[PDB]
A paper describes a structure:
In the sympathetic nervous system, endogenous epinephrine and norepinephrine regulate various physiological functions by activating adrenergic receptors (ARs). All ARs belong to the G-protein-coupled receptor (GPCR) superfamily. α2-ARs are Gi-coupled GPCRs that can inhibit adenylyl cyclase and decrease intracellular cAMP levels. To investigate the mechanism underlying the molecular recognition of epinephrine by an α-AR, we solved the structures of human α2A-AR bound to epinephrine (an endogenous agonist) or dexmedetomidine (a synthetic agonist) and in complex with its cognate signaling Gi heterotrimer (Gαi(G203A)Gβ1Gγ2). We solved a 2.8 Å cryo-EM structure of the epinephrine-bound α2A-AR and Gi signaling complex and a 3.2 Å cryo-EM structure of α2A-AR–Gi in complex with dexmedetomidine.
Dexmedetomidine is a highly selective α2-AR agonist used for prolonged sedation in hospitalized patients, procedural sedation and general anesthesia and treating emergence delirium. Overall, the structures of the α2A-AR–Gi complex are similar in the presence of epinephrine and dexmedetomidine, with a root-mean-square deviation (RMSD) of 1.1 Å over 865 Cα atoms. However, there are local conformational differences, especially in the ligand-binding pockets. While some of the interacting residues are common to both ligands, epinephrine and dexmedetomidine each form different interactions in the orthosteric ligand-binding pocket. In the complex of dexmedetomidine–α2A-AR-Gi, the conserved and critical S2155.43 and S2195.46 residues (which interact with the hydroxyl groups on the catechol ring of epinephrine) are located near the two methyl groups on the phenyl ring of dexmedetomidine; however, the residues do not interact with these groups directly. Even though the imidazole group shows greater flexibility, the most interactions occur with F4277.38 and Y4317.42. Interactions between dexmedetomidine and residues F4277.38 and Y4317.42 in α2A-AR were similar in the GaMD simulations and in our cryo-EM structure. A salt-bridge interaction was observed between dexmedetomidine and D1283.32, with the CZ atom of D128 (negative charge center) and the N atom of dexmedetomidine (positive charge center) maintaining an average distance of 5.47 ± 0.45 Å. In contrast, dexmedetomidine formed only three hydrogen bonds with the α2A-AR residues Y4317.42, C1323.36, and F4277.38. In the epinephrine–α2A-AR–Gi complex, the hydrogen bond between residues Y4317.42 and D1283.32 was stable, while large fluctuations were observed in the dexmedetomidine–α2A-AR–Gi complex. Additionally, the interaction between α2A-AR and Gi is less stable when bound with dexmedetomidine than with epinephrine, as measured by the distance between the DRY motif on TM3 of α2A-AR and the last 5 C-terminal residues of Gi.
Author numbering:
A (entry chain R): 47 to 182, 200 to 242, 380 to 457
B (entry chain A): 11 to 53, 182 to 324, 330 to 354
C (entry chain B): 3 to 340
D (entry chain G): 8 to 67
Write the structure that this text describes.
């Protein structure tokens, strides 16, 4: 099944780019969405666009044709250019967590210093951390060295998932001391997806990735399927972080409809 | 030339807007004998009172000097982080100066009802203040509160009357699901700090839809 | 007895009402019935003067037809340049509650006003640096809802104190006071010769105030609610009132009656500004439905719509040249619908 | 109350006896003026770009 899978990947790419472009446009062309926090949304949407254009077209081929990559010198720079265009996302989900934690736990103190002078620095810090974690017949198997998979796995998806899971179990606590108006299902559900999605899509991959370090019998086909959830998560991301907010929804209604 | 001048003008305007956005604004309202001046002291046209508590920045606009129709200029106050309101508990024993047999507190409720159930302040929360508590606590010892409500049961009492009045005041915000109404019986600025911290946190906790 | 005054006043009002009828021959819509329609009118925002950080509450085109003022709740009174969009000036006010503006006819002074009940006047050409508050006229008992220069000295303001007042910017003393108007005074407009001006109260009425002798001359009624705007036919013999009744009306100074009523079923919101084309045949009415409807002042048949604003239109002004329409809405952008 | 009512009555009597003109003459003097300034209105009759300083013309 080649044409069907290629078409499915094409649907993936189209949806990803469409949603991220919509979010990027709605963030700018709207008076209401003028808060500084939206710089993170714009940067994350840009990362989703990049990983949806410069990455998927090649890594779908490498699995479809089932043979030598198209090229031998453009790999050493995309093999680490798809592994840094995801870590950018996985760490922008650990930055939109610290932001949306400090804007609740310490409101008055953080509502000052909540200006672009620091948001830009944070975004540059994320985009340099990603790069630091990216650089460490024949097929281009992702570099699996006994000392590089461990560090990449525990620096790219075990800090950003131990810092957005110890930062969304508080916003659950705070959202219990600050509602007192029978909104139990509101702050209890929407806080379950933003992590429910982030860990159902990704973790099934990283678990096997670093589990190979002990040579466990991970099936090859199932692993090469787990490999492909990262991009679908890069697709699902813009809607998760934008639907619920009222201003984003109004901008979506005004632009799309 | 003109391009550079206008660029510098834009830069200054952006800087001033950024510095101003870090302010909290409080429209202060009350009836004639409400006692808002007492609140201002403790804590023509618009009078702006700028203060700072625990390293914050409040502006409070007193507009009671404006003797004209209220629906024609209230538009300007759509965007205040809260609306402080002041009522006079010793005002249930005063009839309107011009009108006859118009209990001053009834007029105060009418004003507050107009403020709350209004199309502009549909989310802007109110912070209610019930001034002159002690004077009322002494006044009620001879004049039953039933004079000002022919639907009252429970003989004169301060632990009950001041809760019944608060009930009648909180029974007027038909937007029960949108705006909160805090209440304190005039550390008052400490209460305003603790009640605008809640507004700021509950407006941050709604930009992401959690609330 | 006072009842004598009441009864005779009632009979006097009835006499006026039944004597106006005698001056009726046929409705304006009958006489102009064979007039040539105007068709459709399209207007596209040539510029979009940007920079305000809050609502926009007024404006005034300069006599040059190039510069234009604009006031916002951001606390700054800006003076733009329509052609290039460069902000020529940006005055930092003292109180950020503004409800008016008035660019001088000679362009050397500007004014302001608002809830502070004070009409401040600013001199643009300091001769040594930036601007400075030239004067501050105080003496009104209510917010200042409109104000226009008679010349570079006299300024006639109107407030919610149920009065108007002609000032003297040289000495800051009310030269005259126009009292006799029941409700507020939501807006006014001078005449071509600056010897008469109509004031529109929130009492559902208008009054043709004189200036020389400080006394009304005529009173027009027929509106069913407040009157948020008013303007003159460019020849100073008719004025169009825009109410919160959602209907504009065209009143005649000479005949002292009502001529046309511009209303439609599809509109239920209230007007907030009106203006005429230089030919006086386009009653541009800036509604509160996010729109700014063009009309046809002689047949009432709407002939366009300037719908481009994300928030209600609060300012609407046609230059003296006649070839532009600057509209300002609560979303902080000024549009120029050439 | 009395004096204010008397002043109102005086104003009303002064404004009642003012003279007027039939609606026909006012209608004629309205439409005649509206016609008189046809070519001088750049909105009623849209003007070409040669007279559109906003679109393309002398702006210096
Ligand atoms: C360690 C690491 C970090 C980020 C991305 C990846 C790769 C490219 C992947 C697989 N599926 C989605 N992304 C890795 C291996």
């Amino acid at each position: 099944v080649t044409l069907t899978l290629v078409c499915l990947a094409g649907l993936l790419m189209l949806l990803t780019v469409f949603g991220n472009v919509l979010v990027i446009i709605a963030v700018f062309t709207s008076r209401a969405l003028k808060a500084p926090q939206n710089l993170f949304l714009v940067s994350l949407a840009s990362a989703d666009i990049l990983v949806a254009t410069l990455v998927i077209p090649f890594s779908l081929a490498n699995e479809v044709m089932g043979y030598w990559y198209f090229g031998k010198a453009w790999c050493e720079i995309y093999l680490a250019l798809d592994v840094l265009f995801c870590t950018s996302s996985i760490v922008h989900l650990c930055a939109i967590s610290l932001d949306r934690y400090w804007s609740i736990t310490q409101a008055i103190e953080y509502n000052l210093k909540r200006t672009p002078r620091r948001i830009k620095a944070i975004i540059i810090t994320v985009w340099v951390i990603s790069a630091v974690i990216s650089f460490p017949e024949p097929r281009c198997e992702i570099n699996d060295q006994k000392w590089y998979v461990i560090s990449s796995c525990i620096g790219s998806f075990f800090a950003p998932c131990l810092i957005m899971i110890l930062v969304y179990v508080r916003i659950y606590q705070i959202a219990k001391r600050r509602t007192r108006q029978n909104r139990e299902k509101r702050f209890t559900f929407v806080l379950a997806v933003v992590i429910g999605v982030f860990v159902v899509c990704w973790f099934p991959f990283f678990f096997t990735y670093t589990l190979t370090a002990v040579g466990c019998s991970v099936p090859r086909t199932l692993f090469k399927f787990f490999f492909w959830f990262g991009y679908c998560n890069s697709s699902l991301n813009p809607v998760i972080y934008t639907i619920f907010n009222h201003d984003f929804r109004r901008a979506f209604k005004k632009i799309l409809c | 030339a003109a391009v550079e001048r206008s660029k510098m003008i834009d830069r200054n305007l952006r800087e001033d807007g950024e510095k101003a956005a870090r302010e909290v604004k409080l429209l202060l309202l009350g009836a004639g004998e409400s006692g808002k001046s007492t609140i201002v002291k403790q804590m023509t046209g618009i009078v702006e009172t700028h203060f700072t508590f625990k390293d914050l920045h409040f502006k409070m606009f007193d507009v009671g000097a404006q003797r004209s129709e209220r629906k024609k200029w209230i538009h300007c106050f759509e965007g205040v982080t809260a609306i402080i309101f002041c009522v006079a508990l010793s005002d249930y024993d005063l009839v309107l100066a011009e009108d006859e047999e118009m209990n001053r507190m009834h007029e105060s409720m009418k004003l507050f009802d107009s403020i709350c159930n209004n199309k502009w302040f549909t989310d802007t929360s109110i912070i209610l203040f019930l001034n002159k508590k002690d004077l009322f606590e002494e006044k009620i010892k001879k004049s039953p509160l039933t004079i000002c409500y022919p639907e009252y049961a429970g003989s004169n009492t301060y632990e009950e009357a001041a809760a019944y009045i608060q009930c009648q005041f909180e029974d007027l915000n038909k937007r029960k699901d949108t705006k909160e109404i805090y209440t304190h019986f005039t550390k008052n600025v400490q209460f305003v700090f603790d009640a605008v911290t809640d507004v700021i946190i509950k407006n941050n906790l709604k930009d992401c839809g959690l609330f | 007895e006072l009842d004598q005054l009441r009864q005779e006043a009632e009979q006097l009002k009835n006499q006026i009402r039944d004597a106006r009828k005698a001056c009726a021959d046929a409705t304006l819509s009958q006489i102009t019935n064979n007039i040539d329609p105007v068709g459709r009118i399209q207007m596209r925002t040539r510029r979009t003067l940007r920079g305000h950080l809050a609502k926009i509450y007024a404006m005034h085109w300069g006599t040059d037809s190039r510069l234009l003022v604009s006031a916002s709740q951001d606390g700054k009174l800006i003076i733009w340049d329509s052609y290039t969009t460069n902000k020529v000036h940006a005055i930092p006010l003292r109180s950020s509650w503004v409800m008016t503006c008035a660019y001088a006819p000679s362009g050397n002074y500007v004014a302001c006003g608002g809830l502070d009940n004070i009409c401040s006047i600013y001199n643009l050409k300091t001769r040594e640096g930036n601007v400075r508050v030239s004067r501050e006229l105080a003496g009104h008992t209510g917010y200042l809802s409109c104000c226009r220069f008679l010349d570079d000295n006299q300024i006639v303001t109107s407030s919610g104190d149920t009065t108007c007042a002609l000032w003297d910017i040289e000495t800051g003393q009310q030269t005259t006071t126009f009292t006799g108007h029941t409700g507020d005074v939501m807006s006014l407009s001078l005449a071509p010769d600056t010897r008469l001006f109509v004031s529109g109260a929130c009492d559902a009425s208008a009054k043709l105030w004189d200036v020389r002798e400080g006394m009304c001359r005529q009173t027009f009624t027929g509106h069913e609610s407040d009157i948020n705007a008013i303007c003159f036919f460019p020849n100073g013999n008719a004025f169009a009132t825009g109410s919160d009744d959602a209907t504009c009306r065209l009143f005649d100074l000479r005949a002292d009656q009502e001529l046309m009523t511009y209303s439609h079923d599809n509109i239920i919101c209230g007007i907030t500004s009106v203006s005429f084309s230089k030919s006086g045949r386009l009653l541009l009415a800036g509604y509160d439905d996010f729109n700014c409807n063009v009309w046809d002042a002689l047949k009432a048949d709407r002939a366009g719509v300037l719908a481009g604003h994300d928030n209600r239109v609060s300012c609407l002004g046609v230059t003296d040249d006649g070839m532009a329409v600057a509209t300002g809405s609560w979303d902080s952008f000024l549009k120029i619908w050439n | 109350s009395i004096a204010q009512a008397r002043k109102l009555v005086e104003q009303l009597k002064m404004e009642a006896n003012i003279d007027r003109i039939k609606v026909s003459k006012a209608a004629a003097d309205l439409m005649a003026y509206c016609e008189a300034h046809a070519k001088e209105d750049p909105l009623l009759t849209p003007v070409p770009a040669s007279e559109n300083p906003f679109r393309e013309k002398k702006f210096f």
